[PDB]
Amino acid sequence: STPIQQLLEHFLRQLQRKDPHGFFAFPVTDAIAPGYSMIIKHPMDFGTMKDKIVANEYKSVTEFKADFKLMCDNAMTYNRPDTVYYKLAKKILHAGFKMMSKERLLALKRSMS
Ligand SMILES: Cc1cc(=O)n(C)c2cc(N3CCCCC3=O)ccc12
Numbered sequence: 001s002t003p004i005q006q007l008l009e010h011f012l013r014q015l016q017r018k019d020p021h022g023f024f025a026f027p028v029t030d031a032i033a034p035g036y037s038m039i040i041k042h043p044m045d046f047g048t049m050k051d052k053i054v055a056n057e058y059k060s061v062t063e064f065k066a067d068f069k070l071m072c073d074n075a076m077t078y079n080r081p082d083t084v085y086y087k088l089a090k091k092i093l094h095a096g097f098k099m100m101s102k103e104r105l106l107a108l109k110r111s112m113s
Pocket of ligand 1: 021022023024025026027028029032033047074075079085
């Protein structure tokens with residue numbers, strides 16, 4: 001397991017600790033979410049992000065963050081604002097973007113010299 005993959009698995013673990021109920025752990029199916037696959041044409045979830053890390057498909061933290069943003073944005077698109085899904089997506093988006101902020105990654109870069 002390479003250096004980049006370790007870093008990504010670390011970010012991924014900290015994000016998933018924000019979702020104790022595993023709402024975002026796996027893909028949303030039309031059977032639990034009517035109309036989901038028509039409303040959300042670019043689905044994403046933490047399981048898929050795990051798989052992509054395992055398959056070494058991420059070239060950068062930017063790419064991992066884009067997937068995480070996608071996941072959150074989907075939940076805020078599909079679900080009404082009074083729902084647990086919308087609220088948790090909104091909270092975790094902002095928290096995960098602080099965690100993986102440009103300035104924090106610069107700090108990390110510094111330390112990796
Ligand atoms: C209805 C619905 C909307 C939504 O945005 N999300 C993220 C959902 C997620 C679930 N899932 C999918 C598998 C992980 C466990 C879970 O609660 C189940 C239902 C939903």
